[PDB]
Amino acid sequence: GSHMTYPTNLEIIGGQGGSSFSFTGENNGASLEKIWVWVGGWQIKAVRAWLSDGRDETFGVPSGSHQEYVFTPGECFTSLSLWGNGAGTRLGAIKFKTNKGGEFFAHMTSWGLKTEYPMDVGSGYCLGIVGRGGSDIDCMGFMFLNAVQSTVLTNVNYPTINQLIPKVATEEIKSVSFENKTSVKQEQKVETSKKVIKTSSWSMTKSFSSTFSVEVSAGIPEIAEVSTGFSISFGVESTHSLEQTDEKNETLTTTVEVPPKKKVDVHITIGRASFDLPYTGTVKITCKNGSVLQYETKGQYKGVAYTDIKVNTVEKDL
Amino acid sequence: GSHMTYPTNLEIIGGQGGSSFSFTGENNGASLEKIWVWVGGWQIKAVRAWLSDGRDETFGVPSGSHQEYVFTPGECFTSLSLWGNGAGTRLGAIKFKTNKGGEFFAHMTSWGLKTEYPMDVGSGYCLGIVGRGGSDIDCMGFMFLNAVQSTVLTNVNYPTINQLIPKVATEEIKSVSFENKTSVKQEQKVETSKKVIKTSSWSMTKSFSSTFSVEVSAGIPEIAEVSTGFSISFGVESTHSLEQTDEKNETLTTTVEVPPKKKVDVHITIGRASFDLPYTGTVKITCKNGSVLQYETKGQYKGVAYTDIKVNTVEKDL
Numbered sequence: 001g002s003h004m005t006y007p008t009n010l011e012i013i014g015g016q017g018g019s020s021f022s023f024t025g026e027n028n029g030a031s032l033e034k035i036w037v038w039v040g041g042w043q044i045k046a047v048r049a050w051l052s053d054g055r056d057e058t059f060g061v062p063s064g065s066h067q068e069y070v071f072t073p074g075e076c077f078t079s080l081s082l083w084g085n086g087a088g089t090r091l092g093a094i095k096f097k098t099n100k101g102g103e104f105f106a107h108m109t110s111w112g113l114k115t116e117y118p119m120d121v122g123s124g125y126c127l128g129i130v131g132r133g134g135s136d137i138d139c140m141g142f143m144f145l146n147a148v149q150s151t152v153l154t155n156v157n158y159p160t161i162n163q164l165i166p167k168v169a170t171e172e173i174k175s176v177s178f179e180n181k182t183s184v185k186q187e188q189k190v191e192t193s194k195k196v197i198k199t200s201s202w203s204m205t206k207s208f209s210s211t212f213s214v215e216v217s218a219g220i221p222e223i224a225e226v227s228t229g230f231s232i233s234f235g236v237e238s239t240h241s242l243e244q245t246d247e248k249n250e251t252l253t254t255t256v257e258v259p260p261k262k263k264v265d266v267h268i269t270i271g272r273a274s275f276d277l278p279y280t281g282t283v284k285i286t287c288k289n290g291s292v293l294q295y296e297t298k299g300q301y302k303g304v305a306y307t308d309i310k311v312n313t314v315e316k317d318l
Numbered sequence: 319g320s321h322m323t324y325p326t327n328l329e330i331i332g333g334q335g336g337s338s339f340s341f342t343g344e345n346n347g348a349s350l351e352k353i354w355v356w357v358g359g360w361q362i363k364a365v366r367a368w369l370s371d372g373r374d375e376t377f378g379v380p381s382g383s384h385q386e387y388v389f390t391p392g393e394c395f396t397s398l399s400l401w402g403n404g405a406g407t408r409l410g411a412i413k414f415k416t417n418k419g420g421e422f423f424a425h426m427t428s429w430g431l432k433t434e435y436p437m438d439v440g441s442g443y444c445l446g447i448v449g450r451g452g453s454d455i456d457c458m459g460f461m462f463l464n465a466v467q468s469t470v471l472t473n474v475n476y477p478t479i480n481q482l483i484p485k486v487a488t489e490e491i492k493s494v495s496f497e498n499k500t501s502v503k504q505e506q507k508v509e510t511s512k513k514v515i516k517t518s519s520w521s522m523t524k525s526f527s528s529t530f531s532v533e534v535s536a537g538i539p540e541i542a543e544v545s546t547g548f549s550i551s552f553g554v555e556s557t558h559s560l561e562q563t564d565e566k567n568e569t570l571t572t573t574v575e576v577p578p579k580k581k582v583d584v585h586i587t588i589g590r591a592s593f594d595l596p597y598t599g600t601v602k603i604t605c606k607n608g609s610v611l612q613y614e615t616k617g618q619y620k621g622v623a624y625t626d627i628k629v630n631t632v633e634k635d636l
C-alpha cells in the first residue's frame with residue numbers, strides 16, 4: 001500500500017471518446033494566461049487556451065461565440081468545479097473563482113447540470129489543461145501545482161562573466177591636504193565613512209514571482225581593485241531573495257606619514273560597479289507533499305557592487 | 319594622558335571680534351541645506367544659512383549680491399578650505415567640494431589670500447556653522463559629523479498603537495467542498511500555500527537616510543485573529559533596515575472531518591493589515607572615534623502584516 005505523490009494535481013471529468021491532449025507548463029513553469037470556452041446544448045464544444053510562455057492551442061471544434069477569462073500575473077484559482085454532461089459522455093460545465101475576486105461559469109445550454117465535482121486547486125497556480133477532444137470536449141481537467149513548501153532558484157551560472165569588462169565609476173569620499181614645515185616626521189590620522197548600497201536582482205516572469213516566494217541559492221558577481229586594474233569574480237554561493245538590497249556604512253582609518261618640509265594631499269575614493277549580464281539556473285519547486293517539479297531557466301542579473309575604500313596619497317614639496 | 323574625542327569636527331578661522339553664534343543640527347541631526355555668502359574687500363561680510371529642519375539665520379550684515387550653494391539630499395562635503403583675511407581679524411574665504419562633483423569658492427575681493435587651512439570634513443555630513451559676527455564675519459567654522467561607525471534608530475514607541483482599531487482585509491486562498499453520503503464520518507487532507515509580503519518602514523529625513531545606513535532596533539506592530547476578532551500587538555524588539563520587505567511561503571496542512579450524510583464547505587483565507595501610524599524614537603550615532611551623537615526623533619511607520627492562515631469549515635445536509 002505504498003503511496004505516490006506528484007507535484008501536480010489533475011482531475012479529469014467527462015467521457016472516454018476523442019483524442020488525448022496535454023497543454024501544460026509542467027515543462028517550464030508556464031501558467032494558464034487566457035481561456036476561451038465554446039458551449040453547446042449538451043457539451044462543452046471547445047476550449048482555446050494560452051499559456052504564459054506564448055503557447056496557444058484549440059481543442060474541440062468551436063461553434064458560436066465564446067466566453068473568456070484572462071488571468072493577470074499572480075492571479076491564482078481559489079476554487080474549481082467541473083460537471084460532466086450528466087450522461088458520462090462529455091464535459092458539461094466549468095466553474096472557477098480566483099484570488100482577485102473573479103469568477104467564471106461556462107456551461108452547456110440545453111441539459112441541466114447533475115453531479116458537481118469540486119476540485120482541490122493545490123497552490124492555485126494553474127499549469128494548464130489536459131483531456132480528450134474531437135468534435136467536442138470529451139473530457140478535461142485543469143492541472144494545478146500542488147501546495148508549495150519552497151521555490152528555490154539554484155545552480156546559477158553567469159556564462160559571460162569572464163568576458164565582462166567592469167564599468168567602475170569613481171565616487172569621491174574625501175580629500176584633505178596636510179603640511180609639515182618641521183624638519184622632523186609627522187603623522188596624521190584620517191577616518192572615513194561611506195554608505196554603500198549593494199544590490200542583486202535575478203529576472204523572473206512576474207506571474208511566477210508574484211505567486212511564489214523565490215529564494216536564490218547563488219554566488220553573485222563581485223568587484224575588487226587589484227594591481228593591473230579592476231577584477232570581476234564569481235562569488236561564493238549563499239542565500240538571497242530574488243530582489244535584494246544590502247546597506248552598510250563602510251569605514252576605514254588611515255595613518256598618513258607626512259615627511260619633513262613636504263605637504264601630503266590625501267584622496268579617498270571608492271568604486272561603484274554596475275553589473276548587467278545573463279544568468280542560467282534551475283528552478284526547483286518542492287511541494288508540501290514531498291514531490292518536486294524542476295526546470296531550467298535563464299534571465300538577466302542586475303547588480304551594484306562596491307570596491308574597498310581606496311586611499312591615494314601624493315607628496316608635494318612646499 | 320587621556321585622549322578626548324568628539325562626535326563633531328569644527329575648526330574656526332578668523333579673528334576674535336564680534337558676537338558668538340552657533341547654528342547647527344547637533345540637537346536634531348539637521349544638515350546644512352543652503353548657504354548664501356556676501357563678500358567684501360577685506361572680509362567675508364555675511365553668511366545666511368538654512369538647515370534641513372527649516373531654520374534660517376543670517377550672521378554679519380549683507381552687502382551687495384551673494385553667492386549660493388544649494389545642497390541636495392545625500393550631498394556631502396568632500397573637502398573644505400578656509401582662509402582668514404591675512405590680518406587675523408576676519409574670515410577671508412571659503413572653498414569646498416561635494417561628493418556630487420560640486421564646487422564653491424567665495425572670497426574677499428581686494429586683499430589677497432594668504433595661508434590656506436584645509437579641513438577634515440569627517441563623514442562629510444555638515445551640521446552647520448559656528449563662529450562670531452558683527453558687521454562682518456569675524457570668524458567661522460563648518461561643523462561636521464565625524465566618520466560614522468553605526469547609526470541606529472532605537473527606543474521606538476508607537477504611542478497610538480493601543481487605540482488603533484484593526485482594519486484587516488481578507489485574502490481568499492482556497493475553497494473546496496466535500497460530500498459524505500455515508501453513515502460514517504470521513505477525513506480529507508487539505509494543503510495550503512500562500513505568498514505573503516510583510517513590509518516595514520520608518521520615515522526619516524531623506525538627507526540623513528541618503529547619507530547614513532540606518533539600522534532599526536524596534537518591535538513592529540503585528541496582527542492576529544483571536545476569539546473576539548482581530549488583535550494588534552507590539553511585537554518583540556529586533557533588528558530591521560529602515561525600509562524592509564520580507565517574503566515567505568506561508569503553509570498549512572489541515573485534516574477536514576466530513577460527518578456522515580453531510581456536505582462540508584472548507585474556506586481558507588488570510589488577513590492582511592496595513593499599518594499607518596506615528597512613531598517616536600532615539601537616533602543614536604556612534605562615531606568611528608568612539609564618541610556618540612544622540613537625539614529624539616518622530617516619524618511615521620508604515621507596514622503590511624498578515625494573520626495566520628485561517629481555515630473555516632461549514633457543514634450542510636445532503
Ligand SMILES: OC[C@H]1O[C@H](O[C@@H]2[C@H](O)[C@@H](O)O[C@H](CO)[C@H]2O)[C@@H](O)[C@@H](O)[C@@H]1O
Nearest residue numbers: 016017018019132133134135136137138
Ligand atoms: O468529441 C466528440 C467526438 O468527436 C468525434 O466524433 C464525431 C462526433 O461524434 C460527431 O460530430 O459526428 C461525427 C461523425 O458522425 C464523429 O466523427 C470523435 O473524435 C469522437 O471520438 C468524439 O467522442
Ligand SMILES: OC[C@H]1O[C@H](O[C@@H]2[C@H](O)[C@@H](O)O[C@H](CO)[C@H]2O)[C@@H](O)[C@@H](O)[C@@H]1O
Nearest residue numbers: 334335336337378451452453454455456
Ligand atoms: O564684524 C566686525 C565687527 O563689527 C562690529 O564693529 C563695527 C564695525 O567695525 C564697523 O562697521 O564700524 C562700527 C562702528 O564703530 C562697528 O561697531 C563689532 O561687533 C565688532 O566686534 C566686530 O569685530
Ligand SMILES: [Cl-]
Nearest residue numbers: 084086087088
Ligand atoms: Cl457526466
Ligand SMILES: [Cl-]
Nearest residue numbers: 402403404406
Ligand atoms: Cl588671517
